[PDB]
């Protein structure tokens, strides 16, 4: 696919519009980027469970670094195959 | 989410129907499952690149599973954050 073969899937399976299928992809995927970016779990039953991995902020202080500070986290994005896709694909 | 907080995202961002947003989720996610189950790759610009990993046939011990067995193929599902989501979420 690419993101446009996505639009022709939606509009073939449902009978919306080509403009409504372009929006509807950036309707799923716009609410998911706001889920992972804000520390929030999504959910898709029988197919996929997305969530983020916020790493544990470290300690860099004095004999190791010089200045006292906790080294910040970062959230990492992921998609589970909901278990169910792992049976579809085996 | 769950799969129904999905339907209210689509129908709020686009103005389709609640029945058209339920279909349009199992429109995108029906075409990923035809990519992943059949060997094909998906594609989404600014968000993702899903693709399956077909196992390379052997007769021996421990590639994916940690057990002694006959290996001949098995497709394993994946989702890339398109690089672009990895910048959103950092």
Instruction: Give the DSSP per-residue string, chain B.
Output: -BSHHHHHHHHHHH---HHHHHHHHHHHHHHHHHHHHHT----BTTTBEE--------EEE-SSSSSEEE--------EE-TTHHHHHT-
The two three-digit tokens of residue B9, written as one number: 């995202």
Partners of B90 on chain A (C-beta within 8 Å) are: 74-75
**B12, B17, B19, B23: CA torsion to nearest 10:** -70
- Distance CA(A39)–CA(A89), nearest Å, equals 29
Residues in chain A with CB shorter than 8 Å from the CB of B5 are 43
The values of phi and psi at residue B59, to 5°, are -135, 100
Chain A residue numbers touching B80 (CB-CB < 8 A)? none
In the 8-state DSSP scheme, what is residue A53? E
Q: How far apart, in whole angstroms, are the C-alpha atoms of residue B56 and residue B66?
A: 15
DSSP category for residue A43: -
Q: Say if residues A28 and A9 touch (Cβ distance below 8 Å).
A: no
Pair type for strands B79-80 and B49-50: antiparallel
* CA dist B9 → A34, A85, B23, B40 (Å): 12, 23, 13, 28
CB count within 10 Å of CB B3 equals 18
How close B68 comes to chain A (CA, Å)? 18
As a CATH number, domain A1-90 is 4.10.520.10
Put simply, the answer to whether B2 touches A30 (Cβ < 8 Å) is: no
Domain ranges in chain B are 1-90
CB pairs under 8 A between A and B: 137
**Strands B49-50 and A49-54: what pairing?**
unpaired
What is the C-alpha separation between A50 and A44, in angstroms, rounded? 8
Q: What are A77's strand-pairing partners?
A: A52
A58 vs A77: CA distance, rounded Å: 20
Q: What b/e string do you get for A14-49 counting C-beta neighbours within 10 Å, with b at 16 or more?
A: bebbeebbbbbbbbbbebbbebbeeeeebbbeebbb
Half-sphere exposure for B18 (CA within 13 Å, toward CB): 3
CA neighbor of B46 nearest in space, from B3, B89, B2: B89
CA distance A6 to B27: 8
Ramachandran angles phi, psi of B40, nearest 5°? -75, 160
Q: How was this structure determined?
A: NMR
Judging by beta carbons within 10 Å of its beta carbon (0-12, 13-18, 19+), is residue B41 exposed, middle or buried? middle
Nearest alpha-carbon partner for B16 in A66, A61, A19: A19
């Amino acid at each position: 696919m690419n993101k446009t073969e996505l639009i022709n899937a939606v509009a073939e399976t449902s009978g919306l519009s080509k403009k409504d299928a372009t929006k509807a992809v950036d309707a799923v995927f716009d609410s998911i980027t706001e889920a992972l970016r804000k520390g929030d779990k999504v959910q898709l039953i029988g197919f996929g469970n997305f969530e983020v991995r916020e790493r544990a902020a470290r300690k860099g202080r004095n004999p190791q670094t010089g200045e006292e500070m906790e080294i910040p986290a970062s959230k990492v994005p992921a998609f589970k195959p909901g278990k169910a896709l792992k049976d579809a694909v085996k």
